[PDB]
Structure 1
């Protein structure tokens, strides 16, 4: 558990029903800059930190620890450039080569999450934080679930635009459920952080998916990458590729 050897800044990087996110510094005589989730239930915050605790990957946000003070406080290393969708909305100069590197970084941290038998559940362009223009990290483990050693999926928001059909129709979440979200994450990435399925409600998306209609190719997206998306958006999970195969394709087309 962390000590209050921690200095918070005043600005809110962000806020929500839980509390508010601030920048801070944790003194270890080299100080670390940190992002901090303060609650304004705790149990949820404890869950989420429990998840981050067992995770260790250059492409996942690190947790430093929990600080129990005037408020409950989840402390994480700080990804300085914030959310992918937001940075991309405001950096349309970002080139295709570079978006592919960023998503290949996501697939790699996802590859690891699948090997460690966690499901993310909320993999979206708003949950991928940028360390630099060339270094991406997955965040927000609030809806993540550790899988038991016997099951392949977890049985249950929601972020319905990012959800696979089996999640909405059955409530099953597996790592190939998150492959589906990653396909939507990639489409947002190539679209420079535009919302997916604009103006459509949940049930209209679901209806659209059942017809076999997918979202279009974004503007300057390389064809291999869009074909990668349709692969990700395989309707039937048994045939949808896991992150082992998403990551292999993405690493390949990068060289």
Structure 2
């Protein structure tokens, strides 16, 4: 079937990394499809010495859909190069478990980074910078006709110099398992995913950023969200949030996808906020 074909293709030069040059280290955690460990890679992509990397691999009780997701992440990330998308360095397909080798983000997920922060100390300026960097990577992805589908603060990584890196491409599709609370209303009711449903998820992410890692729709069971959204309910303006920022969020959550901003409009708005402040 489709997976057995992808597996066999994968196991049969630009991306293949010698397994002997990879030294696995500390476990960082478990993602959408497997487990992530810190590692050092000797002579990665013509670089001197050891480069610190993150390595993705499957758990032993992996399902076909988890393996499909790993190979999907590899196949998407090969096509991508942007400062605010996590970089793929390669894969080990010839020696034991399949491994993907990716750029290491030393601060971990944006969500943890924020939850450990107070308003390190972060200013609204920082937060808008973070949002803009993500919106740039998203513009780039949308231009390439890739729909991410799983945009969330848990899926953005914070690299050296607090640079945002869009991560976790297991669910992305070259134009469901996405948590209900980050999904666009048409994705919930019609199962459609487009750049405009990525814009919806981006609005939930903005809300996460502004609340420094809050949990969306708190006290609302995801099973009860479908009906609340269809009748027009949205999250209220959070505590330390401007009218303009909240206007931006709300527009991401317009019922009609055509009435949502595009990522260029989202980037424009944050560039304007930055300079005017």
TM range (shorter): over 0.9
Tell me which of 193, 199, 218 is aligned to 1:198: 218
Q: Provide TM-score, normalisation by structure 1.
A: 0.92
- Which of 82, 85, 107 lines up with 1:57 in the alignment? 82
Does residue 25 of the first structure (1) align with residue 40 of the second (2)?
A: yes
Aligned counterpart, 1:78: 104
Question: Is the CA contact 2:33–2:170 (under 8 Å) kept in the aligned structure 1?
Answer: no
Shift of 1:16: 5.2
Aligned equivalents of 2:32 and 2:245: distance in 1? 36
Equivalent position SS for 1:219: coil
Larger Rg: 2
Alignment map for 1:180-219 (pairs within 5 Å): 180-219=200-239
Alpha-carbon distance between aligned partners in 2 of 1:232 and 1:250, rounded to the nearest angstrom: 14
User: Cα distance, 1:52 vs. partner?
Assistant: 0.7
Aligned residue pairs total: 246
TM-score, length of structure 2 as denominator length: 0.85
Match of 1:225 among 223, 240, 245: 245
Query: Residue in 2 aligned with 1:153?
Result: none
Q: Secondary structure at the match of 1:231?
A: helix
Alignment of 1:28-43 (within 5 A): 28=43, 29-40=48-59, 41=64, 42-43=67-68
2:123 to 91, 95, 119: 95
- Cα distance in 2 for partners of 1:18, 1:245 equals 32
Using the TM superposition, give the Cα deviation of residue 46 of structure 1 relative to its aligned residue in structure 2, in angstroms. Answer: 1.1
Match of 1:112 among 140, 150, 154: 140
Higher strand content, 1 or 2: 1
- Displacement of 1:179 in angstroms is 0.4
Task: Tell me which stretches of 4 or more aligned residues in structure 1 moved more than 6 Å.
Answer: none
Whole-angstrom CA distance in 2 between matches of 1:16 and 1:170: 26
Kindly report the root-mean-square deviation, in angstroms, between the aligned alpha carbons of the 2 structures: 1.5
* Alpha carbons 2:203, 2:250 under 8 Å: kept: yes
Instruction: Give the helix-richer structure, 1 or 2.
Output: 2
- Unpaired segments of 5 or more residues in structure 1? 148-155
Contact 2:34 2:58 in 1 (8 A): yes
Q: Distance in 2 between matches of 1:216 and 1:105?
A: 25
